[PDB]
Design a protein around this nucleic acid. Sequence first.
DNA 1: GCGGGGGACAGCGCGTACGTGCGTTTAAGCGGTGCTAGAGCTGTCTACGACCAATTGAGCGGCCTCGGCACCGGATTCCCAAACACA
Length: 73
Amino acid sequence: PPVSELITKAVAASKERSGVSLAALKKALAAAGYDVEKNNSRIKLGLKSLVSKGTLVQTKGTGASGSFKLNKK
DNA sequence: GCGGGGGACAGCGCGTACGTGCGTTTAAGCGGTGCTAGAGCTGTCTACGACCAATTGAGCGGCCTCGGCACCGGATTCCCAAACACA
């Protein structure tokens, strides 16, 4: 399954008012058996694609270093 | 021993400052010349310090006193830690 679903599912499972950090996303995907080490660069890209698709709102920071929430709009 | 909160450490981004490279300029390095100030050595003779015996008073041990400082309690003050009002 593509990493955009795994990320969206992790952000939905950890839904809050702040927003899953990249470190929490790493932890959730690793707990989901996804190798976050080798494919970290893929994650940053896929995450960026999800922000560029507007599917994730950046709530703090800039780019992948930030916190993110599912764009309910 | 325990609760917790701040700091250490991890991850990311970015932007500019440092490394690499190239061409030009500059002055370091080398050699060579010349001059003279001063370092190094020597002889003299003289004032200056070591040595010694005698004198003595300055300093050291021993006693004694009191005041400066330590201590205690009581009052004064001064930073504190969130909670509140209000943005």
